[PDB]
Design a protein around this ligand. Structure first.
Ligand SMILES: COc1ccccc1Nc1cc[nH]c(=O)c1C(=O)Nc1ccc(N2CCN(C)CC2)cc1
Length: 303
């Protein structure tokens, strides 16, 4: 048949971890900064805790818990465990610099070509891992890429992520982010690893423009026709034709014509070896970005 998913779901006691502050309090739920102190392990792990009780919200949170427990890659957000309180809490690694979208907006004047191209390689690596795992993300964007360190980023938000068996995912209704979606996804609700490639193109565009909103002011209903006419996002000023051509290729009508994530890794790696030949940023190179006794990072806390 199909391969058994032998992932281990860890249940954590509310007493094993201590909340410190609130990082974000969105309409969907709250995200807290905290510390996880397992059993008598003499370690302190900096965590993110994502929590009225409704049976439907628990069903969705447990679905995201399933997906996250089933992924293990340096460029994919790792689930540490769940805490079965009144409302189910997801415990994950603290990404202390927040989302990449806000990070690029906040640090425009200090982000160099090396960092941008490295982020691109890193996102493609994480994305190619999900492809190996037959996982279609369906919500890749700069807001869904977390920053561990300025030199290390990870893909997050598996709220829409779908697992395949033997080529495409046919969706139902639900609120979807139109401006990051492939044409087939808009017109037919079809999602594939190649639809994630389109979203990857937009994510790269977001970074190269230092956090600009795609199609600013254009309503989501117009988008479908804008794409059908053969219009795409403009060339960011810092982008050479070399980089912009990669973006344009991710935005082909024919999904099989778009690049594969494994090709995006290669393409961006070659560029990352000589960043100034591919991105033109004024004042580049001179630019630079950044009880604790038993504190250990989750990436170093294996079991
Ligand atoms: C809100 O971001 C998310 C989007 C989708 C899914 C999950 C998250 N939140 C997660 C999930 C896992 N780990 C994390 O650290 C986070 C997170 O948001 N962390 C997070 C968020 C914000 C910060 N600050 C960065 C500096 N800034 C000036 C103030 C806020 C730090 C960490």
């Amino acid at each position: 048949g199909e391969a058994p998913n032998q992932a281990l779901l860890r249940i954590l006691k509310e007493t094993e971890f201590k909340k410190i502050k609130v990082l974000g309090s969105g309409a969907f739920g709250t995200v807290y900064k905290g510390l996880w102190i397992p059993e008598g392990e003499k370690v302190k792990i900096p965590v993110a805790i994502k929590e009225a009780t409704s049976p439907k919200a628990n069903k969705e949170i447990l679905d995201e818990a399933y997906v996250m427990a089933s992924v293990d890659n340096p460029h994919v957000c790792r689930l540490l465990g769940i805490c079965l309180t009144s409302t189910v809490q997801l415990i994950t690694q603290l990404m202390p610099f927040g989302c990449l979208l806000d990070y690029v907006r906040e640090h425009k004047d200090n982000i160099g070509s090396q960092y941008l191209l490295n982020w691109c390689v890193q996102i493609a690596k994480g994305m190619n891992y999900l492809e190996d795992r037959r996982l279609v993300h369906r919500d890749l964007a700069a807001r869904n890429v977390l920053v561990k360190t300025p030199q290390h980023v990870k893909i997050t938000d598996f709220g829409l992520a779908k697992l395949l068996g033997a080529k495409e995912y046919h969706a139902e209704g639900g609120k979807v982010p139109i401006k990051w979606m492939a044409l087939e996804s808009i017109l037919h609700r079809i999602y594939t690893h190649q639809s994630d490639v389109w979203s990857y193109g937009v994510t790269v565009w977001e970074l190269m423009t230092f956090g600009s909103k795609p199609y600013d002011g254009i309503p989501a209903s117009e988008i479908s026709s804008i794409l059908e006419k053969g219009e795409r996002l403009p060339q960011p000023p810092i982008c050479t034709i070399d980089v912009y051509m990669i973006m344009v290729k991710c935005w082909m009508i024919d999904a099989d014509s778009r690049p594969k994530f494994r090709e995006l890794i290669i393409e961006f790696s070659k560029m990352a070896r000589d960043p100034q030949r591919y991105l033109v940023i004024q004042g580049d190179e001179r630019m630079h970005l950044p009880d604790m006794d038993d504190v250990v990072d989750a990436d170093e806390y294996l079991i």
